[PDB]
Symmetry: C3
Subunit: 343 residues, 3 copies
């Protein structure tokens, strides 16, 4: 909600509380998942063509006891935007790959999980320098593109250390570069994204699968978004980039997500989705295995802009086998039930 608009600056303080419960035969996925999100979005007019901006968003778990409660920053970035020239921002932000994979990340609770946070340039991550150009310098309506650099986020100790080092190898990265292009016309959308990040020494030298010099991704995507209908599909091919449970990464992974949704005038929005991550030549005697495979059925009822409720049903199609047990991957179904206040 816009709580300030005055003398060239405006500020939106926004947030939600999601009363959320998971039901599953997998006990680690069963029970209270209530949480809160909170952020600010600030925009200042410097000149008629130049705006300055910043955004910060935080998540705070509401399902924990008071002696041990966890929270985290999702995004935190500052930038400048010049008219018909583009924008630049730096901070914690979304990897440019997400400019396309985001098109299928629209389910009530599940979805968006053929990749992770702090997973190279695929989703949220630290130290993104992002240039964006919208409508191609004002010349081609609907043609957007982005160039992005992500600086090394290394270990907390020793060789490969950065000031913001983290010991979880799955959250590290070397220097990376990526780009995205998207074209939208009359509700139809086509898009493509590529990224290439150097892998750190720790990532290649702690005995995990899916090692090599570089983590790489190539994504194609399509969407239709008009007349109350939302259709979208993304295909992504990754190398040393896609996490395979606790085992490491996939030497090669083939990822696919498709979604269909409809919005009835009275407020109900049914949803049907399919997601799949296919691991190829994984190593360690595993060969080809599904990392992820599920169908998703759900519905959100929107009372108005500030209040909604939903059910999301993940029909988990993975078989319980050696690989999924070793990897620690959930092969059970989950139902999510939520009641959501936002401002």
């Amino acid at each position: 909600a816009e709580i300030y608009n005055k003398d060239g600056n405006k500020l939106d303080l926004y947030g939600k509380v999601e009363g959320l419960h998971y039901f599953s035969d997998n006990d680690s996925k069963d029970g209270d998942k209530t949480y809160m999100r909170l952020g600010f979005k600030g925009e200042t007019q410097v000149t008629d063509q130049l705006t300055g901006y910043g955004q910060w968003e935080y998540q705070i778990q509401g399902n924990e006891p008071e002696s041990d409660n966890s929270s985290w920053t999702r995004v935190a970035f500052a930038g400048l935007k010049f008219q018909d020239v583009g924008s630049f921002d730096y901070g914690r932000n979304y990897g440019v790959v997400y400019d396309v994979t985001s098109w299928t990340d629209v389910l009530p609770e599940f979805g968006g999980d053929t990749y992770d946070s702090d997973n190279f340039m695929q989703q949220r991550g630290n130290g993104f320098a992002t240039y964006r150009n919208t409508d191609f310098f004002g010349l081609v309506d609907g043609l957007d593109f982005a160039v992005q650099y992500q600086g090394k986020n290394g270990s907390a100790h020793g060789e490969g250390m950065t000031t913001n080092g983290r010991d979880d190898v799955f959250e590290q990265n070397g220097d990376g570069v990526g780009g995205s292009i998207t074209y939208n016309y009359e509700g139809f959308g086509i898009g493509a994204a590529v990224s290439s990040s150097k892998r750190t020494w720790d990532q290649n030298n702690t005995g995990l699968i899916g090692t090599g010099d570089r983590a790489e991704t190539y994504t194609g995507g399509l969407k239709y978004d008009a007349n109350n209908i939302y259709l979208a599909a993304q295909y992504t091919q990754t190398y040393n980039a896609t996490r395979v449970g606790s085992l490491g990464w996939a030497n090669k992974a083939q990822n696919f997500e498709a979604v269909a949704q409809y919005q009835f005038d009275f407020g109900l929005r049914p949803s049907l989705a399919y997601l799949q991550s296919k691991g190829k030549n994984l190593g360690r005697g595993y060969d080809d295995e599904d990392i992820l495979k599920y169908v998703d059925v759900g519905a959100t009822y929107y009372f108005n802009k500030n209040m909604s409720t939903y059910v999301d049903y993940k029909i988990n199609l993975l078989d319980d086998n050696r690989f999924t047990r070793d990897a620690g991957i959930n092969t059970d179904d989950i139902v999510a039930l939520g009641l959501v206040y936002q401002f």
Copy 2:
């Protein structure tokens, strides 16, 4: 403070800073206790009869160094309210027992401590589904009641695991059910509450006192709140529910709290209170012991709605003996001195 009210939604961002110091011969109770509280309370009109709402409240300690600062979510819930029918909300919230025990929880700093947070359905806790009906379907002014279910919050590992598991056994619970009834007329209040929670395996199998299948509470309460006078008393009988320091819980505990307060026109509000928790047949050679016993004398001076100062004097009547030392219970007096800004 209401910082947004527009197009069917309103938002109260509220908070306080309590400059607070404790004085005690017990060194673990002596010194700086400064802290901050912050929250939001949001209400949306869906139709003329249906409102949606959410609330989040957070505490942030202000008495710690910057290298190691602790905070936590007190409440975080979403709900719906239909006129003359009732409300439902789910999240982290107050156990229905507190609908009555809260009547004596009005001291400047102390009080409210014959029970804990994350202590079955007695106070704040995770995963409360709460139905409430006010004025009995609009038929009986002042007659309110509540039915509440609390879902299992189990261990972080192994048998009895939940997705939000916690290893501190004192913060776990099984499935629980409770109810409350309250009648208020012309400043007089009568009320009752019952709860019954299943105990977890961990809680019954780590060698603590006060084990059994279920944690149970029965509470009766009375209050007078008018003509600048506040009188209140609550009696609660608990089984396997009341924490006894580090030792476990009380097989049976008899808890009593009484409070008298007066508000002078010029701003001073003196306070006198008595609290007692009597443990019965505790086990481990202890038999009957006082878990808590103190008299409380204090005064709050209210400069206005946003600024106040207070002294609270806990006259601790527990004797230093084997039980209190073993349990780690404070038997010393504490004086609290506070200066409080709120919005």
Copy 3:
């Protein structure tokens, strides 16, 4: 930004996002330093002469992954202010020494580091009771002074325990007292501050250098702040007060900071600074050593009140030798590059 002003209370919710990157040959100083700051400042009119107030400020790192994100309270205090009589506030706040040392703490990113947080009464710390008088009871325009007491913040365990105890010996303190006087006339400023804190048992008995009964500081300072020119210098002499890396404190330290800045009408503000901390008779075979010594060159460009960008270049003049390696002191240069949105 002022987001509430109503019926005698006002509230400023303020904050910034600093997209920040460090470049250094020292890997522990190299990489993403993005962070967010957020606070509130609240003022209530009680009477025409008496205001109540509170302030809370929090920092949240934005350079960390989502599994492990760190934050902390910088200030958190409540107070009262009576006209021509002075103010009193209690909480976590700034030590009165900072009333003068702050005059050189104006660099874009570096500076302000001949002392620390939670470092006796030199900067931010817990449990400050501060009295302040501005314009000497309304009689001498520009004459301000402060008397401050800081209560013991002791260990988490055993002898010397406080309720807010901390095991990091560098963050502990005994009871302390301090004062400050400042005179400002027509852009010229002269000032002095003294503090004296008792040292804790832990601080004197864990085998560190720079032990003794008391940590003491004496500070003199000068500034010129007009006609777009900012000049400032502070000299501080400390005993058992100034931290020497991991080794302990300096038996005596001589600290000096000087700063020159200019603000061009079009927005650029160049900055040149010099900082030095000279350790005397340190013990452990070290004798006299520089604890800190660097020249600082930088520039901030202010797009407007809400948006700015800067480069800060710390030319580190310390030599890599036995002392700096043993102490763990950075002897390398750092360049900081920042883009800053604030409200």
